[PDB]
Amino acid sequence: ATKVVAVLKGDGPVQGIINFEQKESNGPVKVWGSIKGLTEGLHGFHVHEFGDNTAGCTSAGPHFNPLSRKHGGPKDEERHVGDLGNVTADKDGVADVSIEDSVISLSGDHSIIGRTLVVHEKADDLGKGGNEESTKTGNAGSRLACGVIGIAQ
Amino acid sequence: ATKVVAVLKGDGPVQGIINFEQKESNGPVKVWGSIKGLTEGLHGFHVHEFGDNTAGCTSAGPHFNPLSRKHGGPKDEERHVGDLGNVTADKDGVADVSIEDSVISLSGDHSIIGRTLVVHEKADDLGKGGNEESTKTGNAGSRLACGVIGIAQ
Ligand SMILES: [Cu+]
Ligand SMILES: [Cu+]
Ligand SMILES: [Zn+2]
Ligand SMILES: [Zn+2]
């Protein structure tokens, strides 16, 4: 496929639709959409390993990391395939997403199809924190909303 | 990879979890789980094309049909890749699913990862109905619950 989508939903007011499109097999991936119900400010944003929603967002597992790297920002050489940094909400709780990433993909080892997109309660420290946790999750906190990444076209 | 799962949710009481497992590259897929809240009897059960939940189960599109064949039963040579026949709910409206299928797959062009699993209101006539719709959707009717098929641990 060249186009997939994830509909984020959680126990709370956080919700949104995120689109992904990749025209070429080894080309970049455009990510866009909106999320509401968020507190003003930054929020972690990543693709998690499992597209398993049997237990809310917690069953999505850790960050998608097929290359067994350490957590990082989307622009850091060292990073999980699923690390998409942070999204920002405005005073009304809305965050407009517009990302372009070259690590995630819709085919091969880096394929995010069938995995989960998650938006966190707090900001992602991009893996620069003075603690081991920062190198695993970025200390972004709990998962407010998530959705399985499915084929849309 | 070899294990995927789908959490079925709808606007009504119908809900459940269905697991899929494919041990060998191109071998058969074991499908099992449980669904509750259904009326007693048969119920259409298919994999639909899109894992698009932007409009509930309606955005899932039609039955997954890469080979452009007509609708049928799982044992038929002529059928949609996504045609998994019917599931049977007991007197208490619980359908214990347990079947194997070698048409669907967790890899390749027949892969159902990132697509949608749907449970219907009525029974799938396996394409033996006396009308045109029968060879299209088996007349299974409305979509009671669905879920995008995602990668499981
Ligand atoms: Cu995350
Ligand atoms: Cu169906
Ligand atoms: Zn990470
Ligand atoms: Zn069909």
Residue A101 identity = D
C-alpha to C-alpha distances, B60 to B29, B72, B114, nearest whole angstrom: 21, 19, 11
> Given CA atoms A122, A128, A130, A131 in this order, what sign does their dihedral have?
positive
Could you tell me which of B33, B44, B27 has the C-alpha nearest to residue B104?
B27
Q: Domain ranges for chain A, please list them.
A: 1-153
CATH number of B1-153: 2.60.40.200
How near does any CA of chain A get to the CA of B45, in Å? 19
> Given CA atoms A68, A72, A74, A77 in this order, what sign does their dihedral have?
negative
Could you tell me which of A115, A97, A96 has the C-alpha nearest to residue A106?
A115
| B-chain residues near A52 (CB < 8 A) | 5, 7, 150-153
Residue numbers of B annotated as active site: 46, 48, 63, 71, 80, 83, 120, 143
> Given CA atoms A58, A105, B57, B14 in this order, what sign does their dihedral have?
negative
**Pairwise CA distance, residues B33 & A74, whole Å:** 37
- Nearest CB to B151 within list A5, A50, A153: A50
Element (H, E) at B135: helix B134-137
How near does any CA of chain A get to the CA of B135, in Å? 23
Q: Which of B52, B116, B153 to mutate to test the interface with A (most CBs of A within 10 A)?
A: B52
C-alpha to C-alpha distances, A152 to A26, A79, A92, B122, nearest whole angstrom: 19, 27, 29, 26
Contact B36, B15 (CB under 8 A): yes
> Given CA atoms B27, B115, A152, A44 in this order, what sign does their dihedral have?
negative
> Given CA atoms B53, B55, B59, B60 in this order, what sign does their dihedral have?
positive
Residue B143: partners with Cβ closer than 8 Å, 6 or more residues away: B10, B56, B57, B58, B60, B118, B119, B120, B121
How near does any CA of chain B get to the CA of A100, in Å? 21
Taking any CB pair shorter than 8 Å as contact, residues of chain A touching chain B are 1, 4-5, 7, 17, 49-54, 61, 113-116, 147-153
Residue A54 identity = T
Which residues have C-beta under 5 Å from ligand 4, the single-atom ion?
A: B 63, 71, 80, 83
Contact B85, B103 (CB under 8 A): no
Could you tell me which of B66, B79, B146, B62 has the C-alpha nearest to residue B108?
B66
Contact A114 B116 (CB under 8 A): no
Contact A64, A112 (CB under 8 A): yes
HEC letters along chain A: CCEEEEEEECCCCCEEEEEEECCCCCCCEEEEEEEECCCCEEEEEEEECCCCCEEEEHHHCCECCCCCCCCCCCCCCCCCCCEEEEEEECCCCCEEEEEEECCCECCCCCECCCCEEEEECCCCCCCCCCCHHHHCCCCCCCEEEEEECEECC
- Nearest CB to A114 within list B7, B49, B114: B114
Instruction: Tell me B39's DSSP state.
Output: P
Q: Which of A22, A106, A113, A116 to mutate to test the interface with B (most CBs of B within 10 A)?
A: A113
Could you tell me which of B118, B122, B80, B119 has the C-alpha nearest to residue B101?
B80
DSSP SS3 for B152: coil
Could you tell me which of A54, A52, A112 has the C-alpha nearest to residue A80?
A112
B116-120 β-sheet, strand order? B83-89, B41-48, B116-120, B143-148
Instruction: Tell me B25's DSSP state.
Output: T
Say whether A43 counts as a known binding-site residue.
no
Residue B10 identity = G
Residue with tokens 């995010």: A112
